Amino acid sequence: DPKVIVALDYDNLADALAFVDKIDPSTCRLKVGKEMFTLFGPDFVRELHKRGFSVFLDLKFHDIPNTCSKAVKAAAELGVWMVNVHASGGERMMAASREILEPYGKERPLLIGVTVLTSMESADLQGIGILSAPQDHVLRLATLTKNAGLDGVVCSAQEASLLKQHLGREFKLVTPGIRPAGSQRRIMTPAQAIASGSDYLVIGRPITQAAHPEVVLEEINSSL
Amino acid sequence: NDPKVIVALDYDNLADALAFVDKIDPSTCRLKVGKEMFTLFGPDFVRELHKRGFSVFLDLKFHDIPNTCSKAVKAAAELGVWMVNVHASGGERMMAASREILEPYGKERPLLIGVTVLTSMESADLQGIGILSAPQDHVLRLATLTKNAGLDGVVCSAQEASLLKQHLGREFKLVTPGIRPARRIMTPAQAIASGSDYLVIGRPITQAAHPEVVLEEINSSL
Ligand SMILES: O=c1ccn([C@@H]2O[C@H](COP(=O)(O)O)[C@@H](O)[C@H]2O)c(=O)[nH]1
Ligand SMILES: O=c1ccn([C@@H]2O[C@H](COP(=O)(O)O)[C@@H](O)[C@H]2O)c(=O)[nH]1
């Protein structure tokens, strides 16, 4: 169970594949987001599966229940390991998505909810009609996600321990915004996040921009 | 006469979708590619539609951090789509960044539209996600945020259309789904008269034995 999910945020297929060729699929999982999926589609995800990697399809679906569920079903058809949706889409939308994956069995993708994007501070939330403190809104949405029957949520390292306390050990926490010691004490390290309760670490640049990415991943894995 | 109908392509198989597109003309409608078909068939499907002469509304409702949402919108511009949308709930900065990344494309950029409150959300659903304001008021708040962020318009219901035009202007485009050809559900003529700039219609056309006739009846009623 590799804990690191490497973020692939390239605007060029050649560079992305050149990078993946340097990595052992038993040492990490990969994340394909809106940029690469909009540019290269499901064939890129298939290219990653052909290479032996498990993928986290980070498309944060957010639409009416019928549509969101069909998008999640499409992710299951692609055979991805994990897929996410916005908790702001509501309990009904999330429940419908979890229901449509039941026939896929034990191999279905893990279905994760997005609470409050890290880019949203109080002023940003007030702009979209949310008056609650961001931390309280995160708990509200994470709880809604668990109640809808989802597998976990994406959360920051700072939010991890509190979520794990309120929602339980089995509810999975996927955490981006991690940096190896060195390279700010305010940003948690992989070890600090895992200790806090993060189940998976989403790491991009520290690995993708490294001269020797296989070495950086080995160092991260060894530190855990 | 510029076509006002955008036909929703919500198929789970490519053969069926293309069999339909082969029987309608791009001078009579535009097409909408949503999360289902894009997740299943990707940008190559949009390219097939473009090769056939159709303009496409890429309905992926991007909602992410500003850097990512903007790179997704830029990707839509690279694909050459006519229109693309994002969630207004993503915030003013996310929306503004998405509009700013399109500047280098000049007039070839796609139209950028905001999604306000999904039709599936009534008061109970909104309260569940921490929104206590009346859905109608929340729609105006989000639509206003979208205009202030520099976007071209929003997706809205036929009922919301006239009020949005009154507050945001004739130049702020309104894309309206939930329309049915001819009493609570507005007809194409009723929605256009209210301010809708485009009408998103799926099943009445995609399930028809004679889609061209249905489109002509709709178009001739405007
Ligand atoms: O608070 C954060 C931090 C990072 N990321 C995303 O997680 C991945 C890893 O980021 P990085 O390690 O390259 O900064 C990227 O896709 C980045 O956009 C977030 O979604 N939220
Ligand atoms: O209130 C609505 C009504 C319809 N649709 C969408 O608009 C398209 C046309 O719907 P229909 O004409 O097939 O009902 C479909 O993609 C449908 O999911 C909405 O998003 N909101």
Side-chain angles (χ1 to χ4, degrees):
Chain A
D1 183 27
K3 305 301 180 300
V4 180
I5 304 175
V6 182
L8 303 179
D9 296 335
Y10 296 88
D11 62 2
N12 175 331
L13 190 60
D15 294 354
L17 295 176
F19 169 81
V20 175
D21 291 343
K22 301 177 181 179
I23 308 301
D24 178 346
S26 63
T27 66
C28 65
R29 294 189 173 86
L30 302 177
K31 186 177 72 68
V32 173
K34 296 172 177 181
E35 185 176 17
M36 300 198 68
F37 194 86
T38 304
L39 291 171
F40 312 112
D43 288 340
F44 174 66
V45 174
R46 296 187 177 94
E47 191 62 350
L48 299 179
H49 295 138
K50 181 180 180 180
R51 285 169 165 78
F53 294 90
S54 295
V55 176
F56 163 39
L57 185 58
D58 181 21
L59 302 180
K60 306 187 176 63
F61 302 127
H62 182 200
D63 207 322
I64 64 181
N66 190 239
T67 303
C68 184
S69 63
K70 294 179 179 179
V72 167
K73 180 180 179 181
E77 288 288 313
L78 185 56
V80 301
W81 169 78
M82 176 181 292
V83 63
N84 61 359
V85 301
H86 274 273
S88 298
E91 185 174 359
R92 292 169 50 267
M93 188 198 71
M94 291 187 290
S97 298
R98 175 58 181 88
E99 293 174 346
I100 207 174
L101 295 179
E102 188 65 10
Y104 292 84
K106 183 177 181 180
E107 302 296 5
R108 66 174 180 86
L110 291 174
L111 184 57
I112 304 298
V114 171
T115 61
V116 180
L117 295 167
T118 58
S119 57
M120 305 294 292
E121 295 294 344
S122 299
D124 300 298
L125 291 175
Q126 295 175 185
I128 67 173
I130 298 298
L131 295 56
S132 298
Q135 302 75 356
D136 294 334
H137 190 67
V138 164
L139 184 54
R140 175 182 295 95
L141 297 179
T143 300
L144 189 64
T145 301
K146 182 181 179 181
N147 291 343
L150 281 55
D151 299 305
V153 294
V154 172
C155 70
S156 65
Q158 297 66 10
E159 294 168 351
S161 299
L162 188 56
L163 296 181
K164 183 66 61 179
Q165 183 177 2
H166 285 84
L167 306 175
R169 65 201 304 177
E170 299 295 0
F171 190 75
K172 303 179 183 300
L173 301 179
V174 178
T175 303
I178 301 301
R179 291 292 180 269
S183 62
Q184 184 64 0
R185 299 175 63 184
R186 297 179 177 88
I187 303 179
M188 292 192 185
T189 63
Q192 289 175 331
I194 292 298
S196 297
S198 297
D199 292 293
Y200 298 99
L201 303 176
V202 175
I203 303 176
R205 290 169 291 178
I207 300 173
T208 62
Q209 296 180 340
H212 301 273
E214 68 293 358
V215 175
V216 176
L217 288 175
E218 185 292 338
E219 293 177 345
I220 294 178
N221 290 332
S222 298
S223 66
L224 302 177
Chain B
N1 296 338
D2 186 39
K4 301 298 180 298
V5 177
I6 303 174
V7 181
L9 300 177
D10 296 334
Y11 296 89
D12 64 359
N13 65 127
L14 189 59
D16 293 349
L18 297 179
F20 167 79
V21 174
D22 284 339
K23 301 292 167 57
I24 56 173
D25 187 288
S27 64
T28 68
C29 64
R30 293 185 174 83
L31 302 175
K32 185 178 73 69
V33 173
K35 294 165 181 287
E36 182 174 19
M37 300 198 67
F38 196 87
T39 304
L40 291 170
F41 313 113
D44 292 338
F45 173 63
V46 172
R47 294 188 176 94
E48 290 288 358
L49 300 182
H50 292 146
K51 184 177 180 62
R52 282 171 164 82
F54 291 87
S55 293
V56 175
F57 163 37
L58 185 56
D59 180 25
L60 300 180
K61 303 187 178 65
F62 301 131
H63 183 200
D64 207 324
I65 62 180
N67 189 254
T68 304
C69 183
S70 62
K71 292 175 178 178
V73 166
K74 180 181 181 300
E78 288 290 306
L79 186 56
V81 301
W82 170 77
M83 176 181 291
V84 64
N85 61 358
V86 302
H87 273 273
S89 297
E92 185 176 1
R93 296 188 300 93
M94 188 200 72
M95 289 187 292
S98 298
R99 178 60 182 86
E100 294 174 355
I101 206 170
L102 295 177
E103 289 295 333
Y105 296 85
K107 63 181 179 182
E108 295 183 348
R109 65 176 181 85
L111 287 166
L112 185 59
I113 304 298
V115 173
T116 61
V117 177
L118 296 167
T119 301
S120 59
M121 305 294 294
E122 292 293 347
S123 299
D125 299 309
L126 293 176
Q127 296 178 9
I129 67 173
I131 298 297
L132 299 178
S133 59
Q136 300 72 356
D137 300 334
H138 189 67
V139 165
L140 182 56
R141 175 183 297 274
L142 295 179
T144 301
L145 193 67
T146 299
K147 185 179 181 180
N148 292 341
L151 281 54
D152 300 306
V154 292
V155 172
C156 72
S157 65
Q159 295 69 15
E160 295 166 353
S162 299
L163 187 53
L164 295 179
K165 287 294 183 180
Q166 182 181 13
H167 286 260
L168 305 174
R170 303 174 64 174
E171 69 290 0
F172 194 71
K173 301 184 183 301
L174 301 181
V175 176
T176 302
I179 299 298
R180 290 292 180 269
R183 297 172 62 186
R184 63 180 181 272
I185 302 179
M186 294 193 185
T187 59
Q190 290 176 333
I192 292 296
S194 295
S196 297
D197 292 289
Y198 301 95
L199 305 173
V200 176
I201 304 177
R203 291 169 292 179
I205 302 177
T206 61
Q207 295 180 339
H210 303 269
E212 290 184 313
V213 174
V214 176
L215 283 166
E216 175 58 7
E217 293 175 346
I218 293 175
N219 292 330
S220 299
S221 70
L222 302 177

